[PDB]
Design a binder for this molecule. Structure first.
Ligand SMILES: Nc1ncnc2c1ncn2[C@@H]1O[C@H](COP(=O)(O)OP(=O)(O)OP(O)(O)=S)[C@@H](O)[C@H]1O
Ligand SMILES: Nc1ncnc2c1ncn2[C@@H]1O[C@H](COP(=O)(O)OP(=O)(O)OP(O)(O)=S)[C@@H](O)[C@H]1O
Ligand SMILES: Nc1ncnc2c1ncn2[C@@H]1O[C@H](COP(=O)(O)OP(=O)(O)OP(O)(O)=S)[C@@H](O)[C@H]1O
Ligand SMILES: Nc1ncnc2c1ncn2[C@@H]1O[C@H](COP(=O)(O)OP(=O)(O)O)[C@@H](O)[C@H]1O
Ligand SMILES: [Mg+2]
Ligand SMILES: [Mg+2]
Ligand SMILES: [Mg+2]
Lengths: 353, 317, 293, 330, 327
């Protein structure tokens, strides 16, 4: 398997990147009967899902990693077979309602309500139990729920709290409505420091010999990962296999292709500011959108690449960030992203000229 | 309790009693006296005499054969693809011994609400049986009838009824009913009618029933001035403190809903004159943002006051 | 319980239910409980009403211990009853003894099906009663213009013929000639044209036709009463004439046709129907010409 | 046994704290039988659901509740067909006979209650199809609408429903209820705590109860027998430490775009919520006496715009950087 | 039976003499009934003005005890699609009236929720069977009705209820409920009514429930404000004075103290300050433009939630910055 999954902490004691967070998780798992609904939020790739699985392993014991995929089928108002994969475990369930689109309301209203209605009585056990009495449902990407699946959950996880518990993983919990955040215990997961990422990469290159020339090459990957442990571990494997398992100080850091294309677009915007350049930028944006890359991330990386240009004055950057905020708000409240993604670029070139 | 309303009691029975659109009514009279009626589409705003013209033409063209020579179908009757294929086909295939130049008439009232498949089958229906029966479509918006159907028809567009034809018909009804009036009351009735005969007759009937004498005070205390003309006055104000005064006194305390004011403002702005296009598009944008705010739940007076303030801000700049 | 009724001839209460379905297949049905019998009344669009009656003689036991009120009204859904008594009737060949029960306002309507082994018990929820009163749609018994007694089979065949010819609209002609002749016809407007079904003047099909001058007392000859009806309402009695021995037709000057169907004891069916405006007054003369033709 | 938010849910109407203007009115309807149509609206976690659940119990009892109560929430479909069929048929239903025990122990009003919780998520047509349903069968069926945004309820429906506003639960009206829960659970806290919890939880008792439960679960895990301090409460509530906020305002005061951008980039990695740092900056800037009237007037609108953009589900990094750049140029 | 009813349903008018506020509409429909010729009516107005109470009382006056079989009342709670119009309404209009009261009446309540196809099909049922049936259309929004349907209907506008009508109905309610109301409490109730009788009755019922003893106790303005949770007329003026005169710290303290005194929300304070500033003699024409525009955005943001303290500070800053133009 990939080094991101192979070297994954499978227990609460194997976590080694945040210790004030691991202690809070141990405090939560000490008495699992009264565990409230949890909402883990933080940057992407910090280890939020790994920590959720480690907490579930501390609560229900080993075996929560024995995952099987049970394909479900749903029908909306106008008869149409809509399919959702449900990765399930003998003690917990993982669902991604965002994968089915705007119709995640029917998934939340049927699957989650049917799970929350089954008491999970098992053999007797009608009094209580630390495990196997209540159930854990993991809702990955809680941010992409379309404000109606979040309304069907407010009473679902409140009335049926005795037989079900929810642990939802999310980043930047702004599009999560206030009633959902009120019913839940907010758990902040900070990103690992560069020293911690370097230590984890050192452990990886110790278990698998890649012949590290200098400890600085692991630090460069950590600084290029911007706090993303999964990305850092992916670039480690990339520069490992692309250099015959021998990392040198001159080894280039491999970055995603869409990031390079966004940087090229930024340089084109800085160099050429005209209508035809705007049309070429629209072609680049369409090509980027054809790869199912979300438009908010396109705008975010484009803005933070334009703010890194050394030939731009402070007045230009203060206008770029303002246009970025305005068009991000427009993109959030919109249907088609090309209009806003082109308007931001047009205003940027109209300001830089 | 058996007295009919004046709208139906004084519905014209001959083409000579239909005021307004003098040239079109004269042409309908020539069609009635000659007989060779072509396929026709009659369009216009509601209540100007489109239906009472087709029915009177059919009566004056058939007479004793009106019972078996006219098939009247409208929106209240089912007009699917099957009715056209069976009922209309059998009526067209029917052989009736009508005088020379006289043809059967299929009056399809409210043809703008007919489905596309029925309209497409009507193409074959008129193509096969054009020598015996003629079709008379009456609608309010002629584009709702498909172009292949319009190609086989002679389009007759009915214009708005002027203030003189309305006064003539109102005076005829007043003389028939012997009601008391004065000139300003009839002028107010015509002004509130806005080119509508049915509304003018209804307002006159209401005024006579309520008070009896048709003057401006009694007319205006039961009938209201058209709210598009008040919205136009509010949107064309120079300074804000009286546009707000109009919006409050003549639109808010009178009972008009905020969504109604916003929807009327859009149509007023689309037809507003003496305003620059750049001003007009910004006004449309502000009205649309206000419409979104009303539709999202905030139907308050403050949201309309802010819209008027933004309109005045864009006007003065 | 305030009311309890037990029977074994469930085919009677099954045909009674099968006579009610034509008047809508999913709506509320009113049940009137008094000492004389059990009656089901159903109204559609305020233009037609059907009133079957199950007498106390159709039940071995008919207690009705209610004393505070002389009659008890309950409103239940017909779709619940029809959907229920269908799957119950899967093994209807068994000796089933239906037991109706009602304990008053707020209590459900109970329908027990015991087979001496299994006692199925169904409780139907009772709903509030609407504003419309069933006594409005009744003919005035001092204004009858015509009173025809017809057999069940002939009327059923005529209704089935009208259904097969389409019959968007229907007409009823009733003239008594001076000599001895009685004319009763069911003229129809349909896709075909203008079709007429003439009931025979013989006394086996048309037992008694009697035309009055709007007072049900003065029998006159040479004048015909004509009733313009919508066959959508006129076809509601077709399922009731299928088990009818004799059918009584009565109409007043107010435009109400009272169809009386008696089955053989048995269920008594009363259907009241309203008559259309007939705003066009040329079809009347064409009816007269057609009958004279 | 259960989470403290579910263990301490008000069972009766006397356990609902800080809302007396509505509970006093509702208690009088126990002796009478003239309960009107009710519209419960207020901030989240104020006790709207618990109040109706306690009123229903006190009015009917656990046995008559199953027959005299229909509750529809956002977890089930409430379209035009559901409103026009299921709700209308339940309103048209006859009031069931109370038992002798029910009539001898509970008031048993001669009507049923239809509770439409989360009514703000219903469409304008499903709400329009409810007006005559509530009006026609008001003598046999009562309606209770629960929502957070009263603007999402149409004006015709809001006119027919008696409006009950649930006040936000602050440290002045929920401190006794929080102290009761602390005492029954034997939670040891310093002086000042249980007020900082209610200050962080702005108008929400559910979040404060969950915060206290989370603090206790760490306090008994440490096993030192020491009182819970406000620092731990702020740490586990997501509140940014004051040193970091002072660093933010010092970086803002310099006004250099690049250093503020780098600090925001290294701050977003710590996982802090934008709605919390913006709120803390609001308290820092508005209450400070070192800023003039013009600066406060401008920054009030800047913070309002930033909060409004953040509430719409936008990128926190971009909004926070733009806000700090705008303050740096004020 | 009628004593276990909400006051908005218990005090529903049964005759045309109990409908207040709308004098010109009633004095017209009564003459229409007296002559016996009732045209096709259209009732338009704000919610809680008395349109349904007027039409039901009118039908009862015309039909007496035959209201059940002579009136077909279809509203938003029933399906009113194209098939319903083409079947139920058409057979109700086409059939005879058993020679009871001459003409039939079809009341289409909440016709603004009706689809355009049904409203277009109803046009040839309204003007064809008008000899035996009359249509009454009740609506709150006229923009959802087709222009032809508006053309074939006599429009009567139901104005918001005047203060005198509210006082006359309040007197009857107080007499029936043996309640006492102070003149200032009546003033507060009428200003909070916004021309709605249903709100008046709902607030009066809650005020009676609020009283410890329903008799021998008078409902003051304090009781009404406590029950309905509205700011007192002095709190709004104090907040406005603090914002307009005091500095940014004292105004912030005064707003928070006023709000925490009685748990006052921000939206009602915003509306009260807007109403107080409406009758202000501004002299710049930009103070009003900035005030209305900023307060409308704050009001819209409150409707979608967010941080309350930030919104309060935004209100204070918006007022302070808008009044900087005036001087
Ligand atoms: N030119 C006219 N002269 C006299 N009465 C008229 C005239 N135009 C309309 N009316 C009156 O308007 C009423 C009905 O007019 P219609 O012809 O049915 O309306 P319309 O023009 O067909 O509009 P629509 O689209 O059918 S609603 C009757 O009372 C007529 O008397
Ligand atoms: N006044 C109160 N007294 C006691 N507990 C309260 C009070 N208000 C809220 N709570 C607690 O808050 C938690 C949730 O209350 P609910 O009423 O169910 O939520 P809510 O008010 O409906 O908010 P929603 O569902 O987001 S609209 C429970 O643990 C209650 O015990
Ligand atoms: N003029 C009035 N006189 C007395 N009571 C009134 C008056 N208008 C309204 N009411 C009361 O307010 C209640 C509701 O008014 P309705 O007439 O039923 O509804 P409406 O006024 O037509 O508003 P909509 O459009 O239906 S929301 C009535 O039952 C009365 O109790
Ligand atoms: N404490 C840790 N020690 C070693 N590796 C870790 C640790 N935390 C996270 N990782 C690595 O990070 C990778 C991705 O983390 P992930 O759970 O996807 O984070 P998030 O849930 O924030 O997306 C995992 O494959 C795991 O190997
Ligand atoms: Mg017409
Ligand atoms: Mg709730
Ligand atoms: Mg109404």
């Amino acid at each position: 398997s990939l080094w991101v999954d192979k070297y994954r902490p499978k227990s609460l004691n194997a976590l080694s990147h945040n210790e004030e967070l691991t202690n809070f998780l141990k405090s939560l798992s000490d008495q699992p009967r009264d565990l409230p609904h949890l909402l883990l939020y933080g940057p992407n790739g910090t280890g939020k899902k790994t920590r959720c699985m480690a907490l579930l392993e501390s609560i229900f014991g080993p075996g929560v990693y024995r995952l099987k995929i049970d394909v479900r089928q749903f029908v909306t108002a106008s008869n149409r077979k809509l399919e959702l994969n449900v990765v399930s475990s003998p003690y917990h369930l993982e669902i991604t309602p965002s994968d089915m689109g705007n119709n995640d309301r029917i998934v939340i209203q049927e699957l989650l309500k049917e799970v929350a209605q089954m008491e999970q009585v098992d053999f007797q056990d009608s009094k209580d139990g630390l495990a196997h009495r209540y159930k854990c449902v993991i809702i990955n990407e809680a941010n992409s729920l379309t404000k109606d699946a979040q309304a069907a959950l407010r009473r679902t996880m409140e009335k049926y709290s005795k037989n079900i518990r929810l642990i939802m993983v999310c980043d930047s919990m702004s599009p999560i409505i206030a009633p959902i955040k009120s019913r839940c215990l907010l758990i902040r997961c900070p990103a690992p420091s560069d020293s911690e990422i370097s230590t984890i990469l050192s452990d990886v290159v110790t278990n698998e010999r890649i012949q590290l020339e200098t400890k600085d090459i692991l630090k460069r990957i950590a600084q290029a990962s911007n706090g993303n442990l999964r990305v850092s571990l992916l670039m480690l494997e990339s520069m490992a296999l692309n250099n015959e398992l021998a990392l040198k100080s001159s080894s280039p850091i491999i970055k995603p292709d869409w990031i390079i294309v966004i940087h090229k677009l930024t340089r084109k915007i800085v160099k050429e500011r005209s209508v035809n350049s705007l049309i070429e930028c629209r072609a680049v944006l369409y090509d980027l959108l054809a790869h199912c890359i979300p438009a908010n991330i396109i705008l975010k990386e484009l803005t933070f690449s334009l703010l890194d240009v050394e030939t731009l004055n402070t007045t230009n950057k203060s206008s770029i960030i303002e246009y970025s905020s305005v068009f991000d708000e427009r993109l959030s409240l919109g249907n088609k992203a090309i209009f806003h993604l082109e308007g931001f670029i047009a205003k940027v070139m109209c300001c830089l000229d | 309790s058996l007295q009919l309303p004046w709208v139906e009691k004084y519905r014209p029975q001959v083409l000579s009693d239909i005021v307004g659109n003098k040239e079109t009514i004269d042409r309908l009279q020539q069609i009635a006296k000659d007989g060779n009626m072509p396929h026709m589409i009659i369009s216009g705003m509601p209540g100007i005499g489109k239906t009472t013209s087709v029915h009177c033409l059919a009566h004056e063209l058939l007479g004793r054969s009106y019972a078996d020579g006219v098939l009247e179908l409208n929106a209240s009757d089912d007009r699917g693809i099957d009715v056209v294929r069976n009922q209309i086909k059998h009526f067209a295939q029917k052989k009736l011994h009508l005088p020379p130049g006289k043809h059967k008439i299929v009056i399809l009232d409210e043809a703008d609400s007919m489905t596309a498949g029925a309209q497409q089958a009507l193409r074959r229906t008129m193509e096969l049986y054009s020598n015996s029966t003629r079709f008379a479509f009456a609608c309010n918006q002629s584009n709702k009838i498909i172009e292949p159907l319009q190609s086989r028809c002679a389009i007759l567009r009915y214009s708005k009824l002027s203030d003189e034809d309305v006064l003539k018909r109102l005076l005829q009804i007043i003389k028939l009913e012997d009601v008391k009036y004065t000139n300003d009351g009839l002028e107010a009735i015509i002004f509130t009618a806005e080119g509508d005969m049915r509304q003018a007759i209804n307002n006159l009937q209401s005024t006579v029933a309520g008070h009896g004498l048709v003057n401006a005070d009694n007319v205006f205390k039961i009938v209201d001035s058209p709210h598009p003309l008040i919205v136009k006055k509010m949107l064309l104000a120079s300074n804000l403190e009286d546009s707000i005064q109009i919006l409050r006194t003549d639109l808010w305390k009178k009972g008009y809903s905020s969504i109604d004011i916003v929807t009327t403002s859009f149509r007023v702005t689309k037809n507003l004159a003496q305003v620059k296009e750049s001003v007009r598009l910004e006004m449309i944008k502000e009205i649309g943002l206000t419409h979104m705010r009303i539709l999202e739940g905030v139907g308050t007076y403050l949201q309309l006051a802010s819209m008027l303030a933004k309109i005045h801000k864009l006007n003065n700049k | 319980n305030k009311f309890s009724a037990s029977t074994v001839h469930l085919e009677h209460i099954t045909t009674a239910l099968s006579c009610l379905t034509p008047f809508g297949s999913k709506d509320d049905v009113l049940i009137f409980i008094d000492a004389d019998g059990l009656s089901f009344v159903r109204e559609n669009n305020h233009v037609i009403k059907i009133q079957l009656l199950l007498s106390r003689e159709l039940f071995m036991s008919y207690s009705y211990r209610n004393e505070t009120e002389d009659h008890m009204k309950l409103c239940v859904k017909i779709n619940h009853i029809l959907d229920s008594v269908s799957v119950m009737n899967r093994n209807s060949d068994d000796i089933v003894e239906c037991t109706l029960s009602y304990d008053g306002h707020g209590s459900p309507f109970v329908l027990i099906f015991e087979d001496s082994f299994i006692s199925e018990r169904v409780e139907y929820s009772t709903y509030l009663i609407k504003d419309f009163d069933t006594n409005g749609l009744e003919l005035d018994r001092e204004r009858i213009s015509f009173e025809a007694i017809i057999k069940g089979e002939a009327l059923h065949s005529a209704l089935k013929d009208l259904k097969e010819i389409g019959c968007k609209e229907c007409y009823v002609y009733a003239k008594t000639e001076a000599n001895d002749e009685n004319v009763f016809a069911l003229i129809s407007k349909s896709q075909l044209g203008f079709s007429k079904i003439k009931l025979p003047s013989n006394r086996s099909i048309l037992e008694k036709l009697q035309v009055f001058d709007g007072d049900s007392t003065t029998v006159i000859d040479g004048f015909a009463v004509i009733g313009f009806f919508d066959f959508t309402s006129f076809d509601k009695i077709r399922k009731s004439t299928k088990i009818a021995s004799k059918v009584l037709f009565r109409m007043d000057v107010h435009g109400v046709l009272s169809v009386n169907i008696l089955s053989q004891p048995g269920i008594v069916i009363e259907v009241c129907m309203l008559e259309k405006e007939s705003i066009d007054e040329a079809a009347q003369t064409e009816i007269e010409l057609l009958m004279e033709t | 046994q259960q989470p403290w938010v579910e263990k301490y849910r008000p069972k009766n109407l006397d356990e609902v704290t800080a809302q007396d203007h509505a509970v006093t009115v509702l208690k009088k309807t126990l002796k009478s039988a003239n309960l009107p149509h009710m519209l419960f609206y207020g901030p989240p976690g104020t006790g709207k659901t618990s109040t109706i659940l306690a009123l229903t119990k006190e009015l009917y009892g656990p046995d008559l509740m199953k027959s005299r109560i229909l509750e529809l929430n956002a977890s089930d479909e409430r379209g035009i067909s559901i409103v026009r069929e299921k709700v209308k048929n339940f309103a048209r239903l006859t009031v069931s006979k109370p038992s002798k025990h029910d009539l001898e122990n509970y008031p048993c009003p001669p009507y049923k209650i239809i509770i439409l919780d989360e009514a703000d998520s219903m469409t304008a047509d499903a709400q329009s199809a409810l007006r005559r349903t509530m009006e026609t069968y008001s003598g046999v069926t009562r309606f209770c609408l629960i929502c957070n945004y009263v603007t999402r309820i149409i004006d015709p429906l809001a006119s027919r429903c008696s409006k009950f506003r649930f006040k936000a639960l602050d440290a002045s009206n929920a401190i006794d209820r929080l102290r009761f829960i602390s005492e029954q659970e034997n939670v040891k806290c310093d002086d000042g705590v249980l007020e900082r919890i209610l200050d962080i939880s702005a108008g929400d008792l559910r979040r404060g109860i969950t915060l206290l439960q989370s603090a206790s679960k760490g306090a008994q895990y440490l096993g030192d027998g020491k009182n819970i301090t406000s620092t731990q409460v702020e740490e586990l509530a997501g509140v940014v430490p004051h040193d970091i906020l002072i660093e933010i305002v010092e970086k803002v005061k310099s006004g250099d775009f690049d250093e503020i951008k780098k600090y925001v980039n290294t701050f977003m990695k710590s996982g802090w919520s934008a709605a919390s740092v913006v709120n803390q900056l609001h308290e820092y800037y508005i209450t400070n006496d070192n800023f003039d009237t013009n600066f406060k007037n401008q920054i009030s609108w800047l913070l309002f715009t930033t909060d409004s953009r953040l509430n719409n589900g936008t990128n926190e990094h971009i909004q926070l950087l733009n806000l700090l750049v705008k303050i740096s140029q004020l | 039976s009628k004593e276990n009813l909400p006051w908005v349903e218990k005090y529903r008018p049964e005759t045309l003499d109990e409908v207040y506020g709308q004098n010109e509409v009633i004095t017209t429909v009564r003459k229409f009934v007296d002559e016996g010729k009732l045209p096709h009516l259209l009732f338009y107005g704000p919610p809680g003005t008395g349109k349904t109470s007027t039409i039901v009382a009118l039908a009862r006056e015309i039909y007496g005890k035959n209201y059940s079989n002579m009136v077909l009342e279809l509203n938003a709670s029933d399906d009113r699609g194209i098939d319903v119009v083409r079947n139920q309404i058409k057979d109700f209009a086409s059939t005879r009236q058993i020679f009871s009261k001459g003409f039939k009446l079809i009341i289409l309540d909440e016709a603004d929720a009706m689809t355009n196809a049904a409203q277009n099909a109803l046009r040839r049922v309204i003007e064809r069977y008008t000899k035996n049936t009359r249509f009454c259309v009740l609506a709150n929004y006229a923009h959802k009705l087709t222009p032809a349907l508006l053309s074939r209907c006599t429009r009567f506008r139901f104005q918001p209820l005047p203060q005198e009508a509210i006082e006359r109905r309040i007197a009857n309610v107080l007499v029936h409920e043996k309640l006492k109301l102070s003149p200032n409490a009546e003033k507060a109730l009428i200003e909070l009514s916004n021309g709605d009788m249903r709100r008046v009755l709902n607030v009066l019922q809650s005020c009676k429930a609020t009283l410890d003893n329903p008799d021998e106790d008078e409902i003051s303005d304090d009781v009404i404000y406590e029950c309905c949770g509205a700011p007192r007329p002095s709190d709004l003026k104090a907040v406005l004075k603090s914002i307009l005169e005091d500095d940014w710290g004292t105004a912030h303290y005064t707003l928070n103290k006023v709000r925490s005194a009685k748990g006052l929300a921000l939206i009602d304070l915003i509306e009260g300050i807007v109403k107080i500033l409406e009758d202000y003699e501004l002299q710049n024409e930009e103070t009003r433009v900035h005030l209305l525009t900023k307060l409308a955005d704050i009001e819209y943001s409150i409707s979608k939630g967010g941080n309350d303290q930030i919104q309060g500070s935004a209100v204070i800053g918006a007022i302070k910055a808008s009044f900087e133009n005036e001087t």
